[PDB]
RNA sequence: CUUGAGUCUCGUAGAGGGGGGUAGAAUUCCAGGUGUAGCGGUGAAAUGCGUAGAGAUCUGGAGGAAUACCGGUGGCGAAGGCGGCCCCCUGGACGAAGACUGACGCUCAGGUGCGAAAGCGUGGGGAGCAAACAGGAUUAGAUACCCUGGUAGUCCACGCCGUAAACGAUGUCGACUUGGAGGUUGUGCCCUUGAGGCGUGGCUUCCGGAGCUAACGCGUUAAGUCGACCGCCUGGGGAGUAC
């Protein structure tokens, strides 16, 4: 999993209040970081299917979040995707 | 089941003790079990079946007991 | 970083060498700003079964809060060192500073 | 032959045939006897009685060695297990230890398939 | 109203769970069944053998009051565990009374040791004590007139498992079961144990502070196989039993009774 | 009638050999939770400890082996 | 807006997954000692192995595979499945309080992935077991059952295959409707006066009420009472076959 400190850092940056944590953008960021982390793992361990399932799920969740953001508020979404470097 | 005959102990008694020890170990039983390969499925089946039987013995019979026979 | 608990068993003919080895091990741990919370020479001890043909061996317990690289290094050292017969580096949640039940 | 006071009796008890082997304490076999050797075949040699007589025979064979003390090591499942040791006792050795030495794997090799009868 | 609620907490306040409050009035006697009513959901099927004192005949007619015991409710229909155990608590209280003045005095008469301590009997009950407790010194009551009258001065008690060895004559003189399971061990230490349930292969006498003994069917008597242990001994009765075998590992202490 | 619940231990120790020895057979085997009456959670832990001990030659794998 | 859905904090149990180490038992083989005529096998035999010294027994070595006891109608996993011990990387679940986000949800044709065993490809490995095969029995025959051997395979790596009574023969998600006896894993209070007492959550085994059902049975984990979405059925054979 993502280390506590790292998570906190992520929250602080993206979250407006820094105590917020549940902001859509923040959540997305958290997901994204985790995904990035797991890439390294999965390069090594290609047959770790069970673990990869979780990763896939996370990705899906992130996508959903992004979609939600888009309909609600476009500018914010755009900003987020610039920050994280998500192609979509 | 390692055993040592005590000082002024009878042979028969010693033998009995040994037998008891063996029984406790469940060595013979173990041997019997490992004589032939049991398919995993079969093993599972026996275990569950046995459990079921045990359950039946415990509860249904208890219920029966409440009512007198004659 | 991560609180390990190590128990290694030295060959009984190398019992006089043990302290030096222990010192060396400690030193390495210290090097990477690693703490060593307890350390207990259990001494010569009768084995429950004869490992590598010998019936006694010299047990050393050692608890360490160290980074994993150093642990790895230690393990490697153990594996190649022929004095140490068995080892058992073993993770732990806390520091566990209080003494072992066989020392007490 | 060198006489020896103390030794081991190994009792290999199979389902089909009992084998009794008297040896010195170090491992070197002194004598042996079997239920198949004692004049029993098939149905007969897979019995306690047969085992007993094998044991007796074995005992007789190691008379010249002059063995007084004896520790017994019993191996395998069979009829010739209790009976054999009794026989040995009768034959007149001081039975010192009675050990079980059945090879029990800790789940190792796959046994052969189950018979369809 | 709250009359009933208050009456309920009142009736809670004026009863307790064990055999403590001597409340059941004996409302029918018939051999071989006594029956009381201690303010419980049903009447006890009492044996007659929890109520005859020391020579075999009954002592209590209608209206008489002994407490029983509790904490076990409904086996189908009925209510209690027996009042005789009740009595054990009273015995415990008298034994405890010693502590106050460092000397409990009654009568103790101990002729011999089943398991290394003379047996002492107080009133109806007889207890077994470790070998030292019977005599203050090396006097030995074997030379004393048989079943002699003294008291009991306590030598040793085991505090969990109930074994008490007490001091005859010499008036002037004044986890847990299984680690150290070597006390009643050595080959044949006789014990006094109440049987619990006889499982048609067994009898399950088990007394010595949270253990389990069997005395299964083979000994029990001097007939082997046709015996059926319910016919031959009892239910709930303190008997002659000793260990014959302990495994401290697969907690099976295998006692005997043919001795 | 579990010991570890009453003692209230956080984790069973493989080094505490004496304690382990109560739960191991004369033949070396780990004793069932039916017989000892150990709680399930603790039982597993105990087993693990025993295994560890066996690896460290503190307890024997079996009575016969040498 | 916060009740659904999710995020954060601290713990919890776990054969969940991937990778790398290691331990002990047992089988097999090799070398040697002791020893002497049987061993083995079956219903009974024989083939087979044995005086070229087997079987038995002890010492030393090699190598592979699997993990006794714990172990449980126990646990984890979407299913397939997962079991010695240790470490590294890693996914999920649950509880405790709070704090936050503010319907972000449910279902899903096509699509994508994972998917026992056997099977295939290339390269390794090969102890035991064993399709095929051989011999010995049995038998009217015995291309079987039983016995003695025994090769693919089982094991590892990386690909493919894409099916199983892949079953709870029971799609997924949500809500609601009497009870009892357990198991397991949290957690709040309570004199833990003791292994307990009173709750409150998660997962789970059995019995049974109303209701439902052709009956059998299911029964708060529904096969009850309803809603949302999908999948599927339309007499047996021909056929899950042909093109």
mmCIF file of C-alpha atoms in Angstrom, chain E residues 1-245:
data_model
loop_
_atom_site.group_PDB
_atom_site.id
_atom_site.type_symbol
_atom_site.label_atom_id
_atom_site.label_comp_id
_atom_site.label_asym_id
_atom_site.label_seq_id
_atom_site.Cartn_x
_atom_site.Cartn_y
_atom_site.Cartn_z
ATOM 1 C CA UNK E 1 -47.776 -1.492 37.412
ATOM 2 C CA UNK E 2 -44.194 -0.605 38.143
ATOM 3 C CA UNK E 3 -45.334 -2.584 41.159
ATOM 4 C CA UNK E 4 -44.413 -5.600 39.027
ATOM 5 C CA UNK E 5 -41.136 -4.112 37.808
ATOM 6 C CA UNK E 6 -40.093 -3.216 41.336
ATOM 7 C CA UNK E 7 -41.384 -6.681 42.434
ATOM 8 C CA UNK E 8 -39.127 -8.215 39.790
ATOM 9 C CA UNK E 9 -36.000 -6.409 40.931
ATOM 10 C CA UNK E 10 -37.062 -7.183 44.488
ATOM 11 C CA UNK E 11 -37.217 -10.875 43.705
ATOM 12 C CA UNK E 12 -33.871 -10.561 41.973
ATOM 13 C CA UNK E 13 -32.562 -9.014 45.179
ATOM 14 C CA UNK E 14 -33.966 -11.815 47.335
ATOM 15 C CA UNK E 15 -32.397 -14.729 45.474
ATOM 16 C CA UNK E 16 -28.921 -15.624 44.176
ATOM 17 C CA UNK E 17 -27.601 -18.206 41.727
ATOM 18 C CA UNK E 18 -25.643 -20.860 43.813
ATOM 19 C CA UNK E 19 -26.898 -23.112 46.514
ATOM 20 C CA UNK E 20 -26.741 -20.370 49.087
ATOM 21 C CA UNK E 21 -30.203 -19.329 50.240
ATOM 22 C CA UNK E 22 -31.946 -22.200 52.023
ATOM 23 C CA UNK E 23 -35.288 -21.714 50.374
ATOM 24 C CA UNK E 24 -36.744 -24.845 48.818
ATOM 25 C CA UNK E 25 -39.394 -26.359 51.047
ATOM 26 C CA UNK E 26 -39.715 -30.099 50.629
ATOM 27 C CA UNK E 27 -43.211 -30.330 49.248
ATOM 28 C CA UNK E 28 -43.420 -34.014 48.286
ATOM 29 C CA UNK E 29 -41.422 -37.016 49.479
ATOM 30 C CA UNK E 30 -41.577 -40.419 47.784
ATOM 31 C CA UNK E 31 -38.856 -43.017 47.653
ATOM 32 C CA UNK E 32 -36.773 -42.493 45.791
ATOM 33 C CA UNK E 33 -37.385 -38.825 44.887
ATOM 34 C CA UNK E 34 -37.396 -35.697 47.044
ATOM 35 C CA UNK E 35 -38.632 -32.410 45.555
ATOM 36 C CA UNK E 36 -38.392 -28.759 46.606
ATOM 37 C CA UNK E 37 -39.278 -25.299 45.301
ATOM 38 C CA UNK E 38 -36.703 -22.572 45.874
ATOM 39 C CA UNK E 39 -38.481 -19.915 43.860
ATOM 40 C CA UNK E 40 -37.322 -21.368 40.498
ATOM 41 C CA UNK E 41 -39.268 -22.009 37.186
ATOM 42 C CA UNK E 42 -39.801 -25.743 38.152
ATOM 43 C CA UNK E 43 -39.396 -28.270 41.073
ATOM 44 C CA UNK E 44 -36.164 -30.343 41.473
ATOM 45 C CA UNK E 45 -36.112 -34.071 41.009
ATOM 46 C CA UNK E 46 -33.920 -34.617 44.045
ATOM 47 C CA UNK E 47 -32.350 -38.001 44.746
ATOM 48 C CA UNK E 48 -32.876 -39.456 48.187
ATOM 49 C CA UNK E 49 -29.126 -39.855 48.451
ATOM 50 C CA UNK E 50 -28.279 -36.200 48.760
ATOM 51 C CA UNK E 51 -30.497 -36.409 51.876
ATOM 52 C CA UNK E 52 -29.729 -39.239 54.237
ATOM 53 C CA UNK E 53 -27.147 -38.585 56.895
ATOM 54 C CA UNK E 54 -24.254 -40.885 57.735
ATOM 55 C CA UNK E 55 -26.195 -44.099 58.414
ATOM 56 C CA UNK E 56 -28.662 -44.351 55.565
ATOM 57 C CA UNK E 57 -32.055 -43.066 56.663
ATOM 58 C CA UNK E 58 -33.812 -39.801 55.789
ATOM 59 C CA UNK E 59 -33.715 -36.734 58.033
ATOM 60 C CA UNK E 60 -36.104 -34.139 56.577
ATOM 61 C CA UNK E 61 -39.916 -34.252 56.300
ATOM 62 C CA UNK E 62 -42.304 -31.807 54.639
ATOM 63 C CA UNK E 63 -41.583 -28.088 54.948
ATOM 64 C CA UNK E 64 -37.861 -28.505 55.521
ATOM 65 C CA UNK E 65 -35.430 -26.171 53.814
ATOM 66 C CA UNK E 66 -32.053 -26.809 52.154
ATOM 67 C CA UNK E 67 -30.602 -24.797 49.289
ATOM 68 C CA UNK E 68 -29.592 -26.716 46.213
ATOM 69 C CA UNK E 69 -27.509 -25.102 43.426
ATOM 70 C CA UNK E 70 -27.808 -23.306 40.093
ATOM 71 C CA UNK E 71 -26.243 -21.711 36.960
ATOM 72 C CA UNK E 72 -27.522 -24.527 34.757
ATOM 73 C CA UNK E 73 -30.948 -23.952 33.233
ATOM 74 C CA UNK E 74 -33.353 -26.327 31.440
ATOM 75 C CA UNK E 75 -32.209 -29.712 30.110
ATOM 76 C CA UNK E 76 -35.688 -30.175 28.602
ATOM 77 C CA UNK E 77 -37.829 -29.804 31.711
ATOM 78 C CA UNK E 78 -36.767 -29.264 35.320
ATOM 79 C CA UNK E 79 -34.510 -27.231 37.606
ATOM 80 C CA UNK E 80 -31.376 -27.710 39.551
ATOM 81 C CA UNK E 81 -28.046 -29.120 40.370
ATOM 82 C CA UNK E 82 -28.087 -30.888 43.748
ATOM 83 C CA UNK E 83 -28.161 -29.299 47.209
ATOM 84 C CA UNK E 84 -25.560 -31.752 48.581
ATOM 85 C CA UNK E 85 -22.816 -29.786 46.815
ATOM 86 C CA UNK E 86 -24.470 -26.818 48.700
ATOM 87 C CA UNK E 87 -23.000 -28.428 51.848
ATOM 88 C CA UNK E 88 -19.532 -28.385 50.278
ATOM 89 C CA UNK E 89 -19.574 -24.586 50.496
ATOM 90 C CA UNK E 90 -20.472 -24.868 54.191
ATOM 91 C CA UNK E 91 -17.561 -27.291 54.638
ATOM 92 C CA UNK E 92 -15.328 -24.836 52.796
ATOM 93 C CA UNK E 93 -16.483 -22.075 55.122
ATOM 94 C CA UNK E 94 -15.598 -24.159 58.187
ATOM 95 C CA UNK E 95 -12.196 -25.012 56.675
ATOM 96 C CA UNK E 96 -11.688 -21.313 55.901
ATOM 97 C CA UNK E 97 -12.686 -20.427 59.521
ATOM 98 C CA UNK E 98 -9.282 -21.983 60.545
ATOM 99 C CA UNK E 99 -7.437 -18.959 58.927
ATOM 100 C CA UNK E 100 -9.052 -16.479 61.455
ATOM 101 C CA UNK E 101 -7.554 -18.208 64.604
ATOM 102 C CA UNK E 102 -5.009 -20.435 62.653
ATOM 103 C CA UNK E 103 -6.787 -23.632 63.989
ATOM 104 C CA UNK E 104 -10.085 -25.280 62.741
ATOM 105 C CA UNK E 105 -11.109 -27.902 65.375
ATOM 106 C CA UNK E 106 -13.797 -30.591 64.817
ATOM 107 C CA UNK E 107 -12.931 -34.294 64.974
ATOM 108 C CA UNK E 108 -10.710 -35.898 62.327
ATOM 109 C CA UNK E 109 -10.266 -39.675 62.281
ATOM 110 C CA UNK E 110 -7.770 -40.958 59.715
ATOM 111 C CA UNK E 111 -7.005 -44.659 59.451
ATOM 112 C CA UNK E 112 -5.137 -44.853 56.104
ATOM 113 C CA UNK E 113 -3.681 -43.293 52.970
ATOM 114 C CA UNK E 114 -5.185 -44.223 49.615
ATOM 115 C CA UNK E 115 -2.608 -41.905 48.037
ATOM 116 C CA UNK E 116 0.028 -41.062 50.675
ATOM 117 C CA UNK E 117 -2.116 -39.002 53.076
ATOM 118 C CA UNK E 118 -4.493 -40.481 55.652
ATOM 119 C CA UNK E 119 -8.198 -40.062 54.792
ATOM 120 C CA UNK E 120 -10.116 -37.679 56.997
ATOM 121 C CA UNK E 121 -13.886 -37.613 57.143
ATOM 122 C CA UNK E 122 -15.837 -34.650 58.554
ATOM 123 C CA UNK E 123 -19.513 -35.271 59.399
ATOM 124 C CA UNK E 124 -21.098 -37.049 56.432
ATOM 125 C CA UNK E 125 -18.279 -36.443 53.935
ATOM 126 C CA UNK E 126 -14.832 -38.068 53.922
ATOM 127 C CA UNK E 127 -11.857 -36.338 52.432
ATOM 128 C CA UNK E 128 -8.380 -37.442 51.290
ATOM 129 C CA UNK E 129 -5.263 -35.566 52.337
ATOM 130 C CA UNK E 130 -1.531 -35.840 51.505
ATOM 131 C CA UNK E 131 0.479 -38.258 53.573
ATOM 132 C CA UNK E 132 2.098 -35.866 56.040
ATOM 133 C CA UNK E 133 -1.166 -34.226 57.100
ATOM 134 C CA UNK E 134 -2.495 -37.204 59.061
ATOM 135 C CA UNK E 135 0.250 -37.102 61.715
ATOM 136 C CA UNK E 136 2.027 -34.120 63.273
ATOM 137 C CA UNK E 137 5.284 -36.054 63.491
ATOM 138 C CA UNK E 138 6.193 -39.637 62.589
ATOM 139 C CA UNK E 139 3.645 -41.065 65.046
ATOM 140 C CA UNK E 140 1.536 -42.957 62.498
ATOM 141 C CA UNK E 141 -2.101 -43.893 63.393
ATOM 142 C CA UNK E 142 -1.566 -47.581 62.424
ATOM 143 C CA UNK E 143 -0.672 -48.279 66.093
ATOM 144 C CA UNK E 144 -3.554 -46.104 67.288
ATOM 145 C CA UNK E 145 -6.918 -47.718 68.001
ATOM 146 C CA UNK E 146 -8.587 -48.122 64.635
ATOM 147 C CA UNK E 147 -10.550 -45.166 63.289
ATOM 148 C CA UNK E 148 -9.537 -43.099 66.329
ATOM 149 C CA UNK E 149 -10.931 -39.808 67.647
ATOM 150 C CA UNK E 150 -8.810 -36.626 67.516
ATOM 151 C CA UNK E 151 -9.923 -33.664 65.298
ATOM 152 C CA UNK E 152 -7.945 -32.674 62.147
ATOM 153 C CA UNK E 153 -5.103 -30.044 62.321
ATOM 154 C CA UNK E 154 -4.483 -28.996 58.763
ATOM 155 C CA UNK E 155 -1.169 -30.076 57.150
ATOM 156 C CA UNK E 156 -1.743 -29.352 53.484
ATOM 157 C CA UNK E 157 -4.459 -28.319 51.087
ATOM 158 C CA UNK E 158 -4.160 -27.924 47.282
ATOM 159 C CA UNK E 159 -6.503 -24.847 47.058
ATOM 160 C CA UNK E 160 -7.862 -25.493 43.483
ATOM 161 C CA UNK E 161 -8.209 -29.226 43.210
ATOM 162 C CA UNK E 162 -9.777 -30.182 46.570
ATOM 163 C CA UNK E 163 -7.417 -32.417 48.547
ATOM 164 C CA UNK E 164 -7.008 -31.612 52.257
ATOM 165 C CA UNK E 165 -4.619 -33.577 54.539
ATOM 166 C CA UNK E 166 -5.440 -33.069 58.285
ATOM 167 C CA UNK E 167 -3.417 -33.699 61.758
ATOM 168 C CA UNK E 168 -4.734 -36.516 63.971
ATOM 169 C CA UNK E 169 -3.912 -36.802 67.697
ATOM 170 C CA UNK E 170 -1.277 -34.657 69.384
ATOM 171 C CA UNK E 171 -3.656 -32.065 70.909
ATOM 172 C CA UNK E 172 -0.714 -30.191 72.436
ATOM 173 C CA UNK E 173 0.771 -29.325 69.056
ATOM 174 C CA UNK E 174 -0.383 -25.926 67.772
ATOM 175 C CA UNK E 175 -2.130 -23.727 31.416
ATOM 176 C CA UNK E 176 -2.891 -24.312 35.047
ATOM 177 C CA UNK E 177 -3.385 -28.091 35.577
ATOM 178 C CA UNK E 178 -1.001 -29.179 32.876
ATOM 179 C CA UNK E 179 2.467 -27.687 33.378
ATOM 180 C CA UNK E 180 3.235 -29.313 36.735
ATOM 181 C CA UNK E 181 1.210 -32.492 36.266
ATOM 182 C CA UNK E 182 3.545 -34.557 38.431
ATOM 183 C CA UNK E 183 1.756 -34.371 41.791
ATOM 184 C CA UNK E 184 -0.661 -37.310 41.622
ATOM 185 C CA UNK E 185 1.560 -38.921 38.987
ATOM 186 C CA UNK E 186 4.025 -41.439 40.073
ATOM 187 C CA UNK E 187 2.386 -44.767 39.342
ATOM 188 C CA UNK E 188 -0.725 -45.378 41.399
ATOM 189 C CA UNK E 189 -1.704 -42.417 43.599
ATOM 190 C CA UNK E 190 -5.257 -43.081 44.765
ATOM 191 C CA UNK E 191 -7.727 -40.203 44.563
ATOM 192 C CA UNK E 192 -11.264 -39.425 45.706
ATOM 193 C CA UNK E 193 -13.209 -38.155 42.720
ATOM 194 C CA UNK E 194 -16.843 -37.495 41.875
ATOM 195 C CA UNK E 195 -18.035 -39.064 38.633
ATOM 196 C CA UNK E 196 -19.756 -36.755 36.161
ATOM 197 C CA UNK E 197 -21.217 -38.568 33.131
ATOM 198 C CA UNK E 198 -21.000 -42.187 32.006
ATOM 199 C CA UNK E 199 -20.732 -42.299 28.245
ATOM 200 C CA UNK E 200 -21.502 -46.082 27.872
ATOM 201 C CA UNK E 201 -17.779 -46.676 27.356
ATOM 202 C CA UNK E 202 -16.694 -44.705 30.394
ATOM 203 C CA UNK E 203 -17.565 -43.022 33.656
ATOM 204 C CA UNK E 204 -15.632 -39.682 33.650
ATOM 205 C CA UNK E 205 -14.486 -39.219 37.223
ATOM 206 C CA UNK E 206 -12.598 -35.908 37.271
ATOM 207 C CA UNK E 207 -11.991 -33.862 40.396
ATOM 208 C CA UNK E 208 -8.421 -32.604 40.746
ATOM 209 C CA UNK E 209 -8.749 -28.950 39.685
ATOM 210 C CA UNK E 210 -9.828 -28.924 36.058
ATOM 211 C CA UNK E 211 -8.715 -32.254 34.610
ATOM 212 C CA UNK E 212 -10.394 -35.229 32.954
ATOM 213 C CA UNK E 213 -10.222 -38.874 33.928
ATOM 214 C CA UNK E 214 -11.959 -41.870 32.354
ATOM 215 C CA UNK E 215 -11.916 -45.328 34.108
ATOM 216 C CA UNK E 216 -13.507 -46.437 30.775
ATOM 217 C CA UNK E 217 -15.080 -49.945 31.083
ATOM 218 C CA UNK E 218 -12.300 -52.494 31.161
ATOM 219 C CA UNK E 219 -11.445 -52.210 34.795
ATOM 220 C CA UNK E 220 -14.419 -50.782 36.835
ATOM 221 C CA UNK E 221 -15.193 -54.200 38.396
ATOM 222 C CA UNK E 222 -13.798 -57.724 37.967
ATOM 223 C CA UNK E 223 -15.880 -58.513 34.865
ATOM 224 C CA UNK E 224 -14.731 -57.146 31.517
ATOM 225 C CA UNK E 225 -17.314 -56.600 28.819
ATOM 226 C CA UNK E 226 -20.891 -57.269 30.002
ATOM 227 C CA UNK E 227 -20.687 -54.603 32.662
ATOM 228 C CA UNK E 228 -22.386 -51.363 31.428
ATOM 229 C CA UNK E 229 -20.941 -48.779 33.893
ATOM 230 C CA UNK E 230 -24.326 -47.208 34.772
ATOM 231 C CA UNK E 231 -25.335 -50.450 36.448
ATOM 232 C CA UNK E 232 -22.132 -50.953 38.352
ATOM 233 C CA UNK E 233 -21.214 -47.712 40.088
ATOM 234 C CA UNK E 234 -23.398 -44.580 40.198
ATOM 235 C CA UNK E 235 -24.103 -41.142 38.858
ATOM 236 C CA UNK E 236 -22.404 -38.250 40.682
ATOM 237 C CA UNK E 237 -20.454 -40.041 43.425
ATOM 238 C CA UNK E 238 -17.003 -39.751 44.980
ATOM 239 C CA UNK E 239 -15.039 -42.969 44.513
ATOM 240 C CA UNK E 240 -11.808 -44.958 44.970
ATOM 241 C CA UNK E 241 -9.878 -43.821 41.828
ATOM 242 C CA UNK E 242 -6.138 -43.422 41.093
ATOM 243 C CA UNK E 243 -4.135 -42.410 37.944
ATOM 244 C CA UNK E 244 -2.467 -45.553 36.439
ATOM 245 C CA UNK E 245 -1.346 -43.256 33.562
#
